Amino acid sequence: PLLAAPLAVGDTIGFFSSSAPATVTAKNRFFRGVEFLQRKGFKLVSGKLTGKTDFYRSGTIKERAQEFNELVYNPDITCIMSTIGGDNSNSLLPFLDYDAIIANPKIIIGYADTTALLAGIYAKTGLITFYGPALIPSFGEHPPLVDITYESFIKILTRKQSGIYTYTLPEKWSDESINWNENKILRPKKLYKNNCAFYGSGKVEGRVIGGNLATLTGIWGSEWMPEIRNGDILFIEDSRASIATVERLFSMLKLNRVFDKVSAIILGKHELFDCAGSKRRPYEVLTEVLDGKQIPVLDGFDCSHTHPMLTLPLGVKLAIDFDNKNISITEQYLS
Amino acid sequence: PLLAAPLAVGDTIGFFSSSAPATVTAKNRFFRGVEFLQRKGFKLVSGKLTGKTDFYRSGTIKERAQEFNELVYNPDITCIMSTIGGDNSNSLLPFLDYDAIIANPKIIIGYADTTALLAGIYAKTGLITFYGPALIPSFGEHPPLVDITYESFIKILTRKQSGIYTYTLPEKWSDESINWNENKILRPKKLYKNNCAFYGSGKVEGRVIGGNLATLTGIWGSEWMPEIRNGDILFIEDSRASIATVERLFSMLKLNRVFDKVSAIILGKHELFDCAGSKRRPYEVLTEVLDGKQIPVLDGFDCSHTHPMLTLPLGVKLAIDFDNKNISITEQYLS
């Protein structure tokens, strides 16, 4: 695999808006995110579309591709971080400078819609990219949850690449839709005990692949969708979807023979899932779709739209121990 | 291709609910549709899931496949018609009796989510299926628009298979979300002049492939997605989508090299398109995505979620005359 250099405190982080123009529409939260990372000692470089709007997006397809490419060309930047997702990052894929990415590997990090870039770049370059924090939703989050997000971010990206890394489980989490772009808190988010479940036994080790499932539909079947291979661990998360949509997306995977290949499935916690009154969870829907297939599932991994969020390298081996109820990175993911 | 027997006045139509349980949730419109077809002389067979609910769907994946298969097994049925769409028909595809479909070809008709079945059955069997009226939304529509929908339905499915068929252009259309599920209209829908546009010149003739584009993402990459080939005419429609979603889906097609293959694109009228205040239409978004690729486009064909709706065979040759502003079926599509 192609590996980026590890992050260090004091490094320069560049940010880009590949879809929604939230540096404008969520300016308060954006500034909170900027100030948070600066106080940690990071220098920030704003992508050229910061502060711009083209209604539903930051700018044209070509301009968004250029914004990203320019961060790649900057020799001072060690980490390229999404500001926020949206719907439209898949548009950029024909125009990203993959040769430049190969020539100077950097940490590329974000989630949700940014999956199209994370998976696309991996498909074209073999670069290990990261499902993790975006500047606005993740680092604009109020304490205490932002601190746990940051603890994972910094641990994953700065640690020595010696031995396996075993994830810590966030004690509490939330998906409550409050304190988004308001300047003051009013009240802290409702906190839930971590209900992550390990369905299966033994230990499964395999290359992790995936991201936001809804977003994967935008690159599916193309040369930018990384091939899912025998033994892969499929990582998928979705946000604010109906149970109808969740069934549709799970069945899509089934039709594509994905469940004949994967050694395990990781389901990220689903932010504000709409069960249409059925009281069913995504795992139950997956079970129906699987039609007897005995795939072990880690249900409710904290790498999704819920807070706090852990940082996950994509394209390297993980080991899920279903008996000991833990998950580890077992393959080197930074240089 | 495999061809079904043509429809005739007095034939038996079977209906199924492969997704949303609208025989319950839109019972008044359902009853109006039933009465409409019965008054035309058709005999109706209710699918086994009629009057049933499983929250967001009519029943389990296997129950829904069984409902469909039972209609295929019935020798009296000439036409199998969707009641309504939803999100979940793609789930049925591993469980349909394709051998029975081949042995007993029937007219299979519906739209929107039912695209998964229409395209899937074609992929598996070569049967020419129909993008057209679903019982509840199409035939439960109040006059005067329902009569135009019916005129197309009956013409396409009963006409002698000799020479080309050239589509009539509905004089007026609407996409208003009113008058859904009550005995009486609240008020008449706004009736728009037909604003269909033919972008290009000369004549393009090729096999038509596609359907509801959002729905195609549910079967994409699988053995149930018909291969798009050089010279095909791509037919796509979507409903109530944001401009953001439309860009995403158009870019999906681009990434999949679809625009390197097709000789023309048909865009169905987009029901209540949300331009996010940009005042842009889907064609303008398509043009950006195409990135200078010159493909003639029929923008605004009346085969979509808008009323009235024409009936279109999928998988047979059409000829679009961009100079004379018309569209014709040029290949036999029923026995």
XYZ file of C-alpha atoms in Angstrom:
670
model
C 0.000 0.000 0.000
C 0.954 3.647 -0.527
C 1.430 5.323 2.869
C 1.386 8.975 3.901
C 3.796 10.404 6.478
C 2.430 10.515 10.053
C 0.859 13.692 11.412
C 2.734 15.763 13.990
C 1.469 18.538 16.265
C 2.415 21.812 14.560
C 1.833 20.436 11.050
C -0.189 22.280 8.414
C -3.704 21.002 7.693
C -5.391 22.103 4.453
C -9.183 22.012 4.144
C -11.456 21.710 1.091
C -15.191 21.824 0.373
C -15.944 19.115 -2.195
C -19.730 19.446 -1.832
C -21.854 21.580 0.528
C -20.637 25.179 1.101
C -20.795 24.917 4.915
C -17.937 27.384 5.545
C -20.718 29.843 4.655
C -23.931 28.078 5.722
C -22.456 26.848 9.026
C -19.954 29.674 9.599
C -20.219 29.638 13.410
C -19.462 25.910 13.624
C -16.737 26.326 10.972
C -14.999 28.981 13.115
C -15.291 26.754 16.206
C -13.554 23.978 14.241
C -10.811 26.304 12.985
C -10.154 27.672 16.479
C -10.187 24.181 18.007
C -7.430 22.851 15.740
C -5.369 26.064 15.912
C -5.375 25.871 19.719
C -4.002 22.326 19.421
C -1.043 23.910 17.602
C -1.945 23.193 13.975
C -1.561 25.674 11.147
C -4.528 25.799 8.780
C -4.614 26.517 5.055
C -8.045 27.388 3.668
C -8.985 25.867 0.312
C -9.773 28.403 -2.414
C -13.540 27.735 -2.221
C -13.759 28.664 1.472
C -16.369 31.418 1.863
C -17.846 30.777 -1.600
C -21.336 29.539 -2.535
C -22.931 28.092 -5.644
C -26.337 27.461 -4.059
C -26.202 23.741 -3.148
C -22.429 23.431 -3.618
C -19.148 25.294 -3.102
C -18.536 25.732 -6.838
C -18.350 24.051 -10.236
C -17.129 20.470 -10.636
C -13.841 21.709 -12.141
C -13.328 24.349 -9.434
C -13.868 21.840 -6.617
C -11.363 19.463 -8.220
C -8.883 22.343 -8.499
C -9.404 23.286 -4.836
C -8.439 19.752 -3.782
C -5.536 19.430 -6.252
C -4.026 22.720 -5.053
C -3.833 21.326 -1.505
C -2.029 18.268 -2.894
C 0.496 20.550 -4.656
C 1.254 22.512 -1.460
C 4.463 21.030 0.022
C 3.696 22.439 3.494
C 0.458 20.449 3.925
C 0.684 17.042 5.642
C -3.067 16.526 6.077
C -5.918 17.297 3.672
C -9.222 17.457 5.556
C -12.805 17.757 4.314
C -14.821 20.696 5.702
C -18.128 18.808 5.326
C -19.907 16.305 3.063
C -23.067 16.770 1.038
C -23.888 14.908 -2.161
C -21.457 15.869 -4.878
C -17.834 14.798 -4.313
C -18.172 11.948 -6.847
C -18.280 14.616 -9.592
C -14.612 15.493 -8.917
C -13.203 12.044 -9.621
C -12.334 12.400 -13.340
C -10.393 15.585 -12.518
C -8.379 14.742 -9.371
C -4.610 14.697 -9.844
C -3.922 11.062 -8.923
C -0.346 11.210 -10.210
C 0.331 14.155 -7.867
C -1.182 12.182 -4.965
C 1.158 9.265 -5.749
C 4.136 11.662 -5.991
C 3.431 13.226 -2.578
C 1.261 11.000 -0.340
C -0.612 12.980 2.321
C -3.183 12.130 4.998
C -6.593 12.498 3.356
C -9.443 12.488 5.856
C -13.208 13.021 5.988
C -16.434 11.027 5.893
C -19.979 10.737 4.508
C -20.140 12.124 0.959
C -16.321 12.415 1.011
C -16.301 8.595 0.802
C -16.402 9.109 -2.996
C -12.956 10.732 -2.809
C -11.584 8.408 -0.107
C -12.552 5.291 -2.087
C -11.783 6.861 -5.492
C -8.261 7.895 -4.481
C -7.602 4.440 -3.007
C -8.853 2.779 -6.213
C -6.533 4.882 -8.394
C -3.419 5.156 -6.199
C -3.515 2.547 -3.430
C -3.136 5.361 -0.889
C -4.378 4.512 2.591
C -6.890 7.267 3.323
C -8.917 7.860 6.458
C -12.565 7.673 7.400
C -12.558 10.280 10.120
C -13.188 13.884 11.210
C -14.360 16.629 8.889
C -13.541 20.136 10.109
C -17.082 21.487 10.515
C -19.225 18.600 11.841
C -16.466 16.849 13.815
C -14.248 19.617 15.208
C -16.996 22.255 15.419
C -18.733 19.959 17.900
C -18.902 21.326 21.451
C -17.011 19.690 24.326
C -17.056 17.120 25.800
C -17.695 14.970 22.707
C -15.215 16.839 20.445
C -12.399 15.962 22.876
C -12.996 12.226 22.412
C -13.099 12.675 18.620
C -9.809 14.567 18.801
C -8.200 11.973 21.092
C -8.793 9.283 18.426
C -7.736 11.554 15.541
C -4.427 12.444 17.191
C -3.740 8.922 18.505
C -4.328 7.194 15.144
C -2.386 9.718 13.055
C 0.630 10.368 15.356
C 1.318 7.008 17.071
C 4.399 4.934 16.274
C 3.702 2.212 13.709
C 4.765 -0.623 16.022
C 2.460 -3.504 16.959
C -1.316 -3.555 16.587
C -3.580 -0.692 17.639
C -6.667 -1.647 19.637
C -9.517 0.886 19.632
C -10.914 2.282 22.855
C -14.708 2.339 23.118
C -16.307 5.754 23.731
C -18.112 5.511 27.079
C -21.008 7.649 25.871
C -22.293 8.872 22.506
C -25.065 10.984 20.957
C -26.919 11.554 17.696
C -29.124 14.401 18.985
C -29.710 17.124 16.387
C -29.016 20.179 18.565
C -26.181 22.727 18.960
C -25.288 22.666 15.260
C -24.606 26.250 14.129
C -25.882 28.208 17.145
C -23.307 30.353 18.941
C -24.357 29.180 22.409
C -25.122 25.718 23.808
C -28.411 26.132 25.767
C -28.055 22.509 26.958
C -25.623 19.585 26.452
C -26.618 16.743 24.117
C -28.409 13.726 25.578
C -25.775 11.045 26.188
C -26.342 7.339 25.600
C -24.401 4.384 26.976
C -22.405 2.656 24.243
C -24.574 -0.169 22.896
C -22.046 -1.525 20.381
C -22.612 -5.258 19.846
C -20.358 -8.058 18.599
C -22.451 -10.625 16.719
C -20.267 -13.671 16.147
C -17.387 -15.640 17.618
C -13.634 -16.047 17.175
C -11.353 -13.543 15.486
C -11.711 -12.218 11.940
C -8.822 -10.432 10.216
C -9.039 -8.797 6.784
C -8.584 -5.630 4.711
C -11.211 -3.033 5.633
C -13.061 -1.389 2.736
C -16.100 0.882 2.447
C -17.423 4.045 4.076
C -20.768 5.795 3.643
C -22.958 3.249 1.834
C -25.382 5.752 0.291
C -22.369 7.615 -1.135
C -20.850 4.428 -2.568
C -23.817 4.227 -4.977
C -22.356 7.282 -6.750
C -19.122 5.502 -7.713
C -20.398 1.920 -7.913
C -19.490 -0.089 -11.015
C -16.834 2.448 -12.061
C -13.030 2.289 -12.022
C -13.183 4.500 -8.896
C -14.944 1.856 -6.807
C -12.259 -0.312 -5.183
C -12.842 -3.992 -5.900
C -14.178 -5.859 -2.874
C -12.137 -9.049 -2.493
C -12.484 -12.407 -0.756
C -11.687 -11.883 2.944
C -12.415 -8.146 3.119
C -14.102 -6.637 6.157
C -16.876 -4.397 4.874
C -17.247 -1.139 6.764
C -20.483 0.752 6.143
C -22.281 3.646 7.815
C -25.300 5.755 6.900
C -27.052 8.819 8.317
C -30.696 9.850 8.791
C -31.939 7.149 6.420
C -35.285 5.400 6.441
C -35.509 1.660 7.019
C -36.741 1.481 3.390
C -33.479 3.032 2.149
C -31.417 0.778 4.434
C -33.087 -2.357 3.019
C -32.484 -1.053 -0.512
C -28.773 -0.478 0.119
C -28.250 -3.826 1.878
C -30.006 -5.620 -0.989
C -27.790 -3.762 -3.478
C -24.759 -5.297 -1.757
C -26.434 -8.734 -1.802
C -27.173 -8.492 -5.542
C -23.519 -7.602 -6.104
C -22.398 -10.804 -4.340
C -20.634 -8.736 -1.659
C -21.866 -11.037 1.115
C -20.225 -14.017 -0.607
C -16.824 -12.306 -0.212
C -16.693 -10.510 3.125
C -15.263 -12.072 6.294
C -17.105 -9.611 8.542
C -19.261 -6.484 8.447
C -18.829 -3.343 10.522
C -21.954 -1.220 10.870
C -21.264 2.333 12.000
C -23.804 3.807 14.407
C -26.699 5.109 12.307
C -27.475 8.761 13.117
C -31.217 9.255 13.748
C -32.346 6.089 11.947
C -36.035 6.128 10.941
C -37.542 2.676 11.543
C -40.987 3.768 10.236
C -42.535 2.548 13.521
C -41.308 -1.037 13.065
C -38.878 -0.663 16.008
C -36.428 -2.615 13.831
C -32.721 -1.780 13.765
C -30.446 -1.920 10.697
C -28.908 -5.199 11.960
C -32.312 -6.929 11.813
C -32.826 -5.705 8.233
C -29.344 -6.964 7.330
C -30.193 -10.365 8.839
C -33.263 -10.696 6.598
C -31.289 -9.666 3.497
C -28.467 -12.130 4.321
C -30.987 -14.999 4.074
C -29.058 -17.343 6.399
C -25.506 -16.220 5.544
C -23.450 -16.441 8.758
C -21.411 -13.227 8.564
C -20.153 -11.905 11.904
C -21.148 -8.282 12.452
C -19.768 -5.513 14.623
C -22.918 -3.438 15.118
C -22.517 0.162 16.264
C -18.871 1.063 15.674
C -18.200 4.701 16.575
C -17.031 5.803 13.123
C -20.017 7.503 11.521
C -22.229 10.615 11.867
C -22.707 10.074 15.610
C -20.506 11.812 18.194
C -17.799 11.124 19.170
C -16.111 9.797 16.037
C -13.068 7.545 15.807
C -10.522 7.689 12.963
C -10.264 4.615 10.723
C -7.681 3.850 8.031
C -9.253 2.314 4.920
C -7.524 -0.354 2.834
C -5.474 -1.995 5.595
C -6.058 -5.116 7.707
C -8.167 -4.940 10.839
C -8.786 -7.717 13.334
C -12.148 -7.974 15.061
C -12.118 -10.241 18.102
C -15.769 -11.168 18.641
C -15.029 -13.180 21.791
C -13.075 -10.395 23.510
C -15.283 -7.679 21.975
C -12.545 -5.508 20.469
C -11.277 -4.176 17.135
C -7.667 -3.524 16.123
C -5.599 -2.158 13.245
C -3.038 -4.862 12.416
C -1.350 -3.456 9.291
C 0.958 -0.434 8.954
C -1.066 2.528 7.648
C 1.390 5.449 7.837
C 5.023 5.659 6.680
C -35.827 -10.485 -27.574
C -38.507 -12.461 -25.720
C -41.974 -11.026 -26.401
C -45.220 -11.190 -24.440
C -48.658 -11.684 -25.979
C -50.383 -8.349 -26.725
C -53.121 -6.915 -24.510
C -56.786 -6.961 -25.542
C -59.981 -5.399 -24.200
C -61.430 -7.797 -21.599
C -58.080 -9.318 -20.603
C -57.117 -10.111 -17.007
C -54.639 -7.833 -15.242
C -52.904 -9.030 -12.079
C -51.441 -6.496 -9.653
C -48.667 -6.755 -7.057
C -47.110 -4.557 -4.377
C -43.328 -5.037 -4.508
C -42.618 -2.170 -2.106
C -44.929 0.405 -0.473
C -48.257 -0.974 0.860
C -50.374 1.636 -0.946
C -53.445 -0.621 -1.326
C -53.783 0.213 2.385
C -52.119 3.638 2.697
C -53.739 5.086 -0.458
C -56.890 2.959 -0.408
C -59.196 5.602 -1.924
C -56.904 6.178 -4.916
C -56.433 2.395 -5.186
C -60.212 1.879 -5.342
C -60.537 4.636 -7.969
C -57.842 2.946 -10.106
C -59.502 -0.468 -9.778
C -62.886 0.953 -10.817
C -61.282 2.845 -13.714
C -59.779 -0.298 -15.265
C -62.876 -2.407 -14.512
C -65.064 0.127 -16.354
C -62.704 -0.255 -19.343
C -63.639 -3.952 -19.332
C -60.579 -5.454 -17.640
C -60.812 -8.262 -15.113
C -58.529 -7.785 -12.113
C -56.638 -10.284 -9.972
C -55.443 -8.955 -6.613
C -51.940 -10.012 -5.557
C -51.757 -11.913 -2.258
C -50.318 -8.909 -0.367
C -53.209 -6.578 -1.257
C -54.607 -5.064 1.954
C -51.529 -6.040 3.988
C -48.889 -3.891 5.706
C -45.454 -4.492 7.154
C -44.881 -0.865 8.163
C -42.888 0.605 5.223
C -43.543 -2.312 2.865
C -46.244 -4.812 1.844
C -44.460 -7.802 3.391
C -41.152 -9.619 3.774
C -38.700 -9.903 0.875
C -39.770 -13.514 0.269
C -43.494 -12.720 0.631
C -43.165 -10.025 -2.040
C -41.286 -12.325 -4.431
C -43.964 -14.987 -3.841
C -46.755 -12.490 -4.615
C -45.113 -11.662 -7.955
C -44.317 -15.300 -8.832
C -47.941 -16.359 -8.209
C -49.124 -13.894 -10.876
C -46.583 -15.367 -13.322
C -47.969 -18.863 -12.568
C -51.538 -17.780 -13.418
C -52.409 -18.707 -17.056
C -55.373 -16.290 -17.130
C -53.194 -13.207 -16.568
C -52.029 -11.292 -19.656
C -50.591 -8.280 -17.824
C -48.794 -8.022 -14.469
C -49.062 -4.441 -13.190
C -47.349 -2.755 -10.240
C -49.694 -1.089 -7.723
C -47.067 1.497 -6.741
C -43.320 1.959 -6.196
C -41.404 2.737 -3.023
C -37.802 1.717 -2.355
C -37.579 -2.034 -2.024
C -38.329 -4.031 -5.192
C -34.594 -4.728 -5.745
C -34.755 -7.082 -2.733
C -36.980 -9.462 -4.728
C -34.513 -10.162 -7.537
C -32.761 -13.284 -6.152
C -36.180 -14.895 -5.574
C -38.142 -14.355 -8.810
C -38.955 -17.441 -10.880
C -37.125 -16.463 -14.082
C -37.689 -19.869 -15.689
C -41.452 -19.409 -15.178
C -41.235 -15.894 -16.653
C -39.488 -17.317 -19.746
C -42.032 -20.165 -20.043
C -44.992 -17.826 -19.514
C -44.124 -14.363 -20.936
C -46.544 -11.655 -19.839
C -46.719 -7.876 -20.094
C -44.885 -6.589 -17.018
C -45.559 -2.911 -16.373
C -44.806 -0.246 -13.769
C -42.314 2.509 -13.025
C -40.164 4.252 -10.400
C -38.932 1.718 -7.811
C -40.361 -1.081 -9.985
C -37.511 -0.265 -12.394
C -35.484 -2.835 -10.404
C -37.867 -5.585 -11.556
C -38.299 -4.259 -15.109
C -34.535 -4.029 -15.710
C -33.734 -7.151 -13.662
C -36.211 -9.367 -15.523
C -34.917 -8.045 -18.857
C -31.317 -8.735 -17.789
C -32.170 -12.304 -16.778
C -34.672 -13.315 -19.477
C -34.511 -10.861 -22.388
C -38.236 -10.200 -21.920
C -39.358 -6.801 -23.167
C -40.969 -5.132 -20.158
C -42.732 -1.778 -19.983
C -42.065 1.524 -18.275
C -45.616 2.652 -17.766
C -48.706 2.961 -15.563
C -48.824 1.641 -12.028
C -52.377 1.011 -10.802
C -52.543 3.497 -7.909
C -50.569 6.571 -8.998
C -51.380 6.291 -12.726
C -54.952 4.975 -12.945
C -56.128 6.479 -9.645
C -55.312 9.916 -11.057
C -58.413 12.103 -11.415
C -59.695 13.162 -14.845
C -58.736 14.705 -17.180
C -55.111 13.519 -17.077
C -55.850 9.820 -16.432
C -57.615 9.533 -19.801
C -54.451 10.556 -21.680
C -52.391 8.045 -19.676
C -54.942 5.357 -20.541
C -55.005 6.313 -24.236
C -51.247 5.644 -24.432
C -51.457 2.442 -22.349
C -54.172 0.923 -24.528
C -52.627 2.086 -27.833
C -49.121 0.756 -27.128
C -50.269 -2.596 -25.748
C -53.122 -3.469 -28.165
C -51.972 -1.960 -31.493
C -50.983 -4.118 -34.454
C -47.224 -4.694 -34.568
C -46.734 -3.327 -38.084
C -44.586 -0.345 -39.033
C -43.167 2.195 -36.607
C -45.205 3.789 -33.847
C -44.731 7.525 -33.348
C -45.660 8.931 -29.931
C -48.311 11.577 -29.503
C -47.303 14.590 -27.419
C -49.592 15.334 -24.455
C -50.952 18.859 -24.928
C -50.861 19.554 -21.191
C -49.124 18.042 -18.162
C -48.754 18.521 -14.408
C -46.530 17.476 -11.520
C -48.472 19.033 -8.638
C -48.595 17.067 -5.386
C -52.325 17.492 -4.724
C -55.507 15.415 -5.181
C -53.792 12.218 -4.027
C -56.096 10.060 -1.887
C -59.598 11.581 -1.581
C -62.940 11.157 -3.343
C -62.875 14.690 -4.732
C -60.133 16.962 -6.003
C -59.260 19.885 -3.730
C -58.960 21.994 -6.882
C -57.795 21.333 -10.459
C -54.061 20.845 -10.991
C -52.073 23.508 -12.830
C -51.862 22.424 -16.459
C -48.600 23.285 -18.188
C -47.986 23.608 -21.903
C -45.697 20.804 -23.020
C -42.164 22.198 -22.879
C -40.330 19.106 -24.156
C -37.125 20.104 -25.961
C -35.095 18.284 -28.614
C -31.414 19.214 -28.206
C -29.535 18.038 -31.298
C -30.067 17.357 -34.992
C -30.841 14.462 -37.338
C -32.157 11.052 -36.311
C -30.794 8.705 -33.664
C -31.958 5.087 -33.592
C -30.910 2.603 -30.906
C -32.032 0.176 -28.203
C -33.589 2.031 -25.255
C -32.336 1.063 -21.780
C -32.888 2.498 -18.298
C -35.771 3.657 -16.119
C -35.801 5.439 -12.770
C -32.185 6.496 -12.255
C -32.263 6.650 -8.439
C -33.667 3.099 -8.511
C -30.951 1.835 -10.886
C -28.385 2.447 -8.105
C -30.029 -0.476 -6.260
C -29.120 -3.012 -8.973
C -26.014 -1.319 -10.381
C -22.949 -3.542 -10.913
C -25.007 -6.715 -10.430
C -26.082 -9.396 -12.919
C -29.550 -7.766 -12.776
C -28.330 -4.493 -14.327
C -28.618 -4.744 -18.130
C -25.316 -3.989 -19.849
C -25.388 -0.618 -21.609
C -23.826 -0.912 -25.066
C -22.441 1.361 -27.773
C -25.334 2.948 -29.662
C -27.966 2.543 -26.930
C -30.396 5.350 -26.138
C -30.351 5.981 -22.385
C -33.771 6.615 -20.838
C -33.787 8.088 -17.336
C -36.297 9.820 -15.086
C -36.274 10.888 -11.456
C -38.829 12.256 -9.002
C -38.751 15.007 -6.351
C -34.948 15.046 -6.270
C -32.709 17.919 -5.256
C -30.315 19.367 -7.822
C -27.561 17.966 -5.556
C -28.944 14.435 -6.008
C -29.346 14.936 -9.766
C -25.694 15.998 -10.142
C -24.644 12.949 -8.097
C -26.623 10.525 -10.278
C -25.487 12.124 -13.557
C -21.865 11.938 -12.393
C -22.416 8.279 -11.436
C -23.339 7.615 -15.075
C -20.304 9.587 -16.280
C -17.919 7.601 -14.062
C -19.417 4.404 -15.462
C -18.526 5.472 -19.030
C -22.231 5.522 -19.975
C -21.754 8.822 -21.842
C -18.959 7.234 -23.908
C -21.441 4.621 -25.179
C -24.909 6.095 -25.670
C -26.023 7.775 -28.903
C -28.827 9.760 -27.235
C -30.355 10.468 -23.831
C -34.048 10.721 -23.008
C -34.831 12.685 -19.855
C -38.299 12.028 -18.460
C -39.996 15.118 -17.045
C -38.718 15.511 -13.468
C -41.610 15.716 -10.992
C -41.197 18.702 -8.654
C -37.451 19.138 -9.201
C -35.819 21.133 -6.394
C -33.245 23.506 -7.920
C -32.182 24.829 -4.470
C -32.937 28.351 -5.729
C -30.391 28.122 -8.568
C -33.198 28.127 -11.186
C -31.200 25.504 -13.118
C -32.890 22.567 -14.844
C -31.567 18.975 -14.943
C -30.403 19.472 -18.569
C -28.012 22.261 -17.499
C -26.559 19.964 -14.820
C -26.209 17.142 -17.378
C -24.401 19.565 -19.699
C -21.832 20.409 -16.988
C -21.264 16.725 -16.193
C -20.860 15.843 -19.903
C -17.763 18.084 -20.017
C -18.061 18.796 -23.752
C -19.283 15.342 -24.788
C -21.846 16.024 -27.509
C -24.876 13.785 -27.037
C -28.329 14.688 -28.360
C -30.926 14.890 -25.596
C -34.699 14.635 -25.629
C -35.437 16.720 -22.534
C -38.914 16.231 -21.064
C -40.386 12.988 -22.417
C -43.760 12.274 -20.787
C -42.756 8.915 -19.316
C -42.055 9.618 -15.661
C -43.798 10.632 -12.425
C -45.587 13.536 -14.149
C -49.165 13.258 -15.462
C -50.098 12.113 -18.005
C -47.735 9.196 -18.514
C -46.985 7.368 -21.747
C -46.165 3.652 -21.983
C -42.640 2.748 -23.153
C -41.236 -0.690 -24.006
C -37.690 -1.079 -22.679
C -34.964 -2.968 -24.523
C -36.188 -2.321 -28.077
C -35.082 0.166 -30.742
C -36.456 3.686 -30.721
C -35.848 6.445 -33.254
C -35.648 10.033 -32.030
C -35.947 12.593 -34.820
C -34.389 15.771 -33.422
C -35.246 17.830 -36.520
C -38.921 16.859 -36.665
C -39.200 16.726 -32.865
C -40.673 13.246 -32.498
C -39.962 9.809 -31.026
C -40.937 6.417 -32.432
C -40.757 2.729 -31.547
C -39.119 0.976 -34.515
C -38.775 -2.610 -33.247
C -41.461 -5.212 -32.498
C -42.118 -5.297 -28.740
C -45.087 -7.687 -28.459
C -45.940 -10.932 -30.279
